[PDB]
Symmetry: D6
Subunit: 166 residues, 12 copies
Amino acid sequence: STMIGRILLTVVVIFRILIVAIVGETVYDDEQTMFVCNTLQPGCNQACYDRAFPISHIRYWVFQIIMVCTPSLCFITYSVHQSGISRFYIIQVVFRNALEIGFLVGQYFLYGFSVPGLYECNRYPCIKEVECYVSRPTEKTVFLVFMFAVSGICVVLNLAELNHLG
Amino acid sequence: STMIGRILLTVVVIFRILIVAIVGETVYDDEQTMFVCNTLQPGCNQACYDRAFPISHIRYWVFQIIMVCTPSLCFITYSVHQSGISRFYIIQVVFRNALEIGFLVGQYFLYGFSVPGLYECNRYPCIKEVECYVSRPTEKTVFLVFMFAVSGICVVLNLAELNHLG
Amino acid sequence: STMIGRILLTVVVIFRILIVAIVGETVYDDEQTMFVCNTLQPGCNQACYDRAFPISHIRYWVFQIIMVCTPSLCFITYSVHQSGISRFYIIQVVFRNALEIGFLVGQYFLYGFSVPGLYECNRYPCIKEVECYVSRPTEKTVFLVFMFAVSGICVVLNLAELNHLG
Amino acid sequence: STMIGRILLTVVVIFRILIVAIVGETVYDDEQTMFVCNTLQPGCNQACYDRAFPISHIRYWVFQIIMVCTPSLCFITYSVHQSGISRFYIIQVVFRNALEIGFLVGQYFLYGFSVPGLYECNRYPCIKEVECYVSRPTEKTVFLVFMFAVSGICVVLNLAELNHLG
Amino acid sequence: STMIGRILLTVVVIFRILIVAIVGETVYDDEQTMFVCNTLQPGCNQACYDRAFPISHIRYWVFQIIMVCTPSLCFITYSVHQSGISRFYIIQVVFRNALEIGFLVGQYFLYGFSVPGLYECNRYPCIKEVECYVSRPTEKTVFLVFMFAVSGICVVLNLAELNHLG
Amino acid sequence: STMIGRILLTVVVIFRILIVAIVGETVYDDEQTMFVCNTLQPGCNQACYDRAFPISHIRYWVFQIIMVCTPSLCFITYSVHQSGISRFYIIQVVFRNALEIGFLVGQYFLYGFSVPGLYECNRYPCIKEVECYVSRPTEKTVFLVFMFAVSGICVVLNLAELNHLG
Amino acid sequence: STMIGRILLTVVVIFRILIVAIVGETVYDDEQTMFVCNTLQPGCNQACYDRAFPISHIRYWVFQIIMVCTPSLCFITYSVHQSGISRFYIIQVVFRNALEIGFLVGQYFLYGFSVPGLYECNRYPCIKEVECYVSRPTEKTVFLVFMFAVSGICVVLNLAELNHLG
Amino acid sequence: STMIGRILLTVVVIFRILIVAIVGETVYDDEQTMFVCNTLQPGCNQACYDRAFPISHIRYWVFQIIMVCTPSLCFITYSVHQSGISRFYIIQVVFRNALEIGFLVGQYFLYGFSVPGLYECNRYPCIKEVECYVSRPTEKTVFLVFMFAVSGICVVLNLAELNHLG
Amino acid sequence: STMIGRILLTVVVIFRILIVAIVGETVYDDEQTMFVCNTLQPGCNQACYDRAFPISHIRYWVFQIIMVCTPSLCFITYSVHQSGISRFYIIQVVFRNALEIGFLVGQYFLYGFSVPGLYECNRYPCIKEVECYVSRPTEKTVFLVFMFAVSGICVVLNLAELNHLG
Amino acid sequence: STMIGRILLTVVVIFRILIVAIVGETVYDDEQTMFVCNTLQPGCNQACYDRAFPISHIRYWVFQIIMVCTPSLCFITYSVHQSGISRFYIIQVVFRNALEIGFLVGQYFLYGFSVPGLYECNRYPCIKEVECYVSRPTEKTVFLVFMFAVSGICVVLNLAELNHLG
Amino acid sequence: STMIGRILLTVVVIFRILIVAIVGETVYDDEQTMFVCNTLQPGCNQACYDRAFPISHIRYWVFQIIMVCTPSLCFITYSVHQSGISRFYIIQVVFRNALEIGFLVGQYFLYGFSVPGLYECNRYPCIKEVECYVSRPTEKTVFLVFMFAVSGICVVLNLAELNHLG
Amino acid sequence: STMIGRILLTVVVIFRILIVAIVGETVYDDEQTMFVCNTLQPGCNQACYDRAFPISHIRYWVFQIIMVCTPSLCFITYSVHQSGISRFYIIQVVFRNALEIGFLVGQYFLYGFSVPGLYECNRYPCIKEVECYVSRPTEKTVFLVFMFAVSGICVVLNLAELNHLG
Ligand SMILES: O[C@H](c1cc(C(F)(F)F)nc2c(C(F)(F)F)cccc12)[C@@H]1CCCCN1
Ligand SMILES: O[C@H](c1cc(C(F)(F)F)nc2c(C(F)(F)F)cccc12)[C@@H]1CCCCN1
């Protein structure tokens, strides 16, 4: 039961990395070039795009992927230098759990579960409130939901192993 | 008879991967930049493109290709860790069959068998119904048909081997 | 006499692959962006480009190159698994001959021997007949002729070897 | 206590390099193409962009990363040629400390801690003072703060080891 | 005297390949996008660009570089299969000489020694004669002269060795 | 004293190559697209850009870097074929010195020490004198000064070693 | 009672003529230049304007004013030539009554009682239905109502006099 | 005292007519052509102009001028036909008083005492509220105030004479 | 019976003159400014407008009106100079009849009975056949029919009087 | 001496009226259409034109001309009704003097003695200060000076006659 | 025979004046606004229009009409002052004949008998020869022919009377 | 001899007035709308037009015509009031002579004898010197020469009469 858990954790991690690396950089390529607002005021598109999308999804996901692999690198560097291992194993498992729960919660609080097609903006230099229009909202919603599901699976598996060792 | 089946399955898989990887990313590059509607309303092109092409073909095909190769990776990781194999062989064959039938059915239900040159749109902020025009419809239809044929071949071969073991 | 034939077949194949891979992808890059028609009708450029160039030359050539190398891959995979060879040699030679004659005939029937600078279009939504103008016709004609010559050489050589074994 | 310090220094360095190399080149790609000023004067955008952003952040960070790794390369080349080592160790540690403090101070003096959305320009050929608008200010502020934090960590660690040897 | 000739021939060949491969593809990138004619007629720019630059310099140089390295590949493939060598050496030297003289003569007859800044065009659909303007003529002239000089050196060296063996 | 000189020469050479290879190709990417002149005459921008920047800095630097590494390649090829060495060492040192002094002098005579923001042009088809505006002048001035400093260091070191052997 | 009726009929007629002659020609001056439709199709504005306003109000009113004054001119010309008068008086009164009732009914059937701000058009070459926008609708509605009121007064007065003579 | 009142009434009336007739038609000529709103929506300018200026000042003033001269025309036509006069004098004086008070009150209720430079509009097809800009507001305010003053003088004089007869 | 004929002829003539003089010059004012063709060719609008409307209706009608009043002017000038009259009366009646029949026939042969909304043009410099769109076709058709009716009435009356004298 | 004064006063008045009436309305016709500011802000041209030219010169001059002729009209109407004259003569002379001095002073205080070619504007919605450019400044300055000279002559003459009667 | 000649001369003169005065000013109104050349050079339209139409037809015709009526005015002024007449009659007849023959010859030499639709221009600043397109050529040709016919009639009549007196 | 001089003076004056009044106002109508300069600087067209044409020809001619008729008006007003005449005759003749010589000299000094097609401008805000292009230069030159000739004739005649009285 604990044998397969490691195999599936490794497979899930590699699957997530591959999905992010091969296709995600090209859904977001035209994010700002196809963003448009109904206005004649210079500079309003810049302010409204910046307010609607402060940090792009793909940047957040790359950062999370890199940060959740640091304890393994630390353990490897330690063992390489060696040339209390069990204490290091315990601590790195604890740290990985904490990091993955923090990142999932932050994703939920930053983005939610959908990307709408319209946005209402009231930032200077825009006069009163203006209406703006988003590029590719459905594909981005699908990507959001898929990433949340994968990260949930990973959280479940790591809690499984944590309780297995105890 | 069962000897050649493995060889042809491997050759078909590699052929499909090569065709998708080398040329497909450059037919779809201008999909939205050359999409145009007969209108003077800001934001109508975005909504109508999003409604006509919710998920691009190339994204779906990359996802399918990656997902149909996961049982092999699991089997490899298991055997590497080992350093009931036959039960694993049976189960992974079953899973591969199921995954490939599901993906073929989903392709048929999402896209059909042709890409038309005109599209009729009635989404806000467009006033009533508008007419829009697609880029490269014939090449995309050819690509659709070719991919369906290859996936059908793969389904047939996997059912062949499933019935061979029994 | 039969000794040099293999050497020249290998050299011709590699030469063709190199020419296609290094330069051909950048002659066709601006094919649709520099295509223009004399009209004020929205959507006419898309329809007329699609009717003039249904499948681009470079796509056809990549497909042909990949498909004419499949019998070798099959033979290699068979011999690797082995770890009636002569029957396989005979059959793969026959298949290669057939495939290369089919592809050369199809090229002639799809494209002919020249690319003209003007095109006359009568597809909806264009009103009556309109005149359109092509990008880089002379270079594309040179490329067409060169590829036909190379494929003819390959056909001759394979028939040579077929008659050598008999 | 001195054992883990080396491991964490190596991990911090690699983390910083990865973050800069994978994502940073694509936040700054549209820096000048989406810079706009409220004016009808030709040449004012060029002068005002040049005055607002004399050296781009990403250029400065690449230069710093390369320059802080030179003492290690020198030590490696020396030891390779050898085929007073401790004196070289002392000197290279001193030099690394000095270089990293200089670069952090220079960053603070060149850029500060935020990127504002508006800029006020009074350079020829602009008539009197004009108002200009920046692209992606929030993401760039986040990047600035993150890089300062990482470099501070590195400074602390190197002072730690310097005082450890004494 | 014959010892150094081989060394310098190899060095000249590698130098030419490096110069062509690293920088030449980016001088010609904007060749047609920055070509402009004084006219209001649709389609005149396409015809006049095609008449002024039938085959681009960089295509011709890549083709020549690849074609002048084929005898070496043939000799290598022959010797590999072997696992009258002197007759092959003689013949391949003769062929290389002929190929390089033909390519140099063709360059002179196709392009000459300079690229002018103005071009006079009288092709349909242009009305009478029109004036057009070229991008980056001085850099292209420098490149032309450099390539002619290198190819002349190579011709001299190969004739040297031909007369050395006799 | 002569021991460290080799180490620092190697380190300086590698540093220069890295700086040129990683960042320099992307400062100059928009050199002509953001060049603008105050005029309504077609073709004036092309002529004035060509007169202001006959050969781009990055082309000159790549050429110099490649040409100053040829004597080493010659020496390596000679020693490989061998499988009067000191005479070759002397001669290649002399040649490297000469080449580096020539390239530094040529840089000074071609470009000077700064890139101004305005340029005054009087070339046909421009009527009388017109005013044009440059992109990113400050960054290009910084790059110029840095490259001059590095090349000066290299000249000093090579003269050092020349006088060391005598 | 019959004495004042003539005075008020003359005053009403002159008032109507003055109102039409002095101001009405300048409300309708920009009728077609400020008519606009939401479309990119050439020729749609012409067809939709023609369908919305077949005959302009001011043309109809001028025609009516001229046609209702013809019996008086006939009577004057007859009396001038004379140099059964009562029969002519009776007949011209009858004719004036008939003409004014016909013109009022026709106005009601052609135009109604209001001018709306939006118009829905489905005429070739417009694709399906389009939305168009009118200039100065409120002023035109006020003018319509005023003219109907005046013509009603005139009808009442002429019936009064008709019944007075009997 | 009653002698001069008639003279000044006649002079005031003629002065008002002259001011309206000679200059007023050319202040309002560009009223709609120089009206502009900050928006990209087709048809918003028409709706907002119509809502801001339902009836133009000059139309109202022409109508008032014509309507306040009708009792005199009636009296003249009566006396001409005659070829109880005092009763007619009394009645026409009463009617003139009433008409002029009504028109002054209506002016105050329709327009007020100033024309502002900005207008806030919320009419379909405009999205939410938009800002629009008026042409020549100061001159129009001056004209408004002048006309109110003149009409007040006329009211005072007519009440004077009414109380004089009693 | 012959008494009223003169009265009605005079009334019809004056009515026709008034209708032409007051309103007709302002229906045709925008005839060429609102004429548009679907094309990108310079000069095609001029040629197609000239071919569709060689002589404008209003010019033809003014010419006809002036030419049908010349015999009266001749008779008046003769009688004024006098200060065989019946022979002059006969001849001028004959001439008026002939002139009016000729002008009516010419109108029918030049214009017909309707003005269509579309026109098909094949004149140089237009490429093949193009489609063009007319301004105000319905109003112009109404005007055509009205003018034909009036001229028919005049013809009938003049034949009446011709047969009356005999 | 007093005899000629009346003749010259009448001639000066008529000359001024003719100059204003025949040419002045066509210098000012394009006053706002050729007014332009260096800005991209919608509505700034309207505000800056309104602030630079609150009341146009030609309006002020027409008003002054009409107002300085009212005492004569009053005197004429009085004498016509008569069908103490000297008291009326005295009073009207006094009033004319006062009116002409007031109008000359007001002209000086409103406009000064020149019209500059540049104007500096700081009114909302313009951001900070902008530069604007005037149409036909020299002709307008000449007109200003001429009108001041004529009005001065008239003032002198009226004071002459005032002191003549005493 | 000589009696009717005067009557017809007077009628022809009045007819010509009426035709020129009522319609001719509105055929030529858009002469330069609808003149267009195929070029991108600023100022070419002005030069080519000026070279194609140095003096407009309508200016020449007005001048001729005014100049051919001067002898009558002279004779009238002489006879009015009188309050050798036959000598004046003779001389003015001679002068009128001469003036009308000169004007007809000049018309033929300036304009010919047709107005073509295309014009070929080679004036600075136009580069080489350009093609331009004329407005309303057919109507202008008709006008030309009509005016020549009328002037010929007048010449014939005046020679008739000259020979009548002798 | 002195009898005809008055007749010809009156005829010349009336001829000049008619030529100026009927046609001259419509040659100059588009003077500034068709004035264009080769530049991208806002405001340069205004400054250069103002510097090229400070006072338009037609304004100068109207002013001169009005000012040369003032002595006659003075003489008429004097004689009307009378209801030393010879002294007035002498003085007005002297004044007319002086005025006409002054105006002719001023014309020569202001305008010269031709209107060129090109103008060279160096006024702020134009950068250095720019080239501008004039509308209708040939017609304006013809008008200039004609007006000079007429004014010369008038000068000659007035000197004739001056010397006749003595
Ligand atoms: O990708 C382009 C390229 C590749 C290659 C190959 F893949 F064969 F090595 N060869 C190139 C050649 C060559 F002549 F075929 F070597 C010329 C120009 C660009 C080449 C260049 C290579 C250098 C870096 C810039 N792109
Ligand atoms: O209205 C313009 C005009 C009018 C008058 C006037 F009202 F005094 F008679 N004078 C004009 C003059 C004149 F020199 F003052 F006579 C010149 C040019 C145009 C004039 C011209 C007159 C002729 C027909 C075209 N408009």
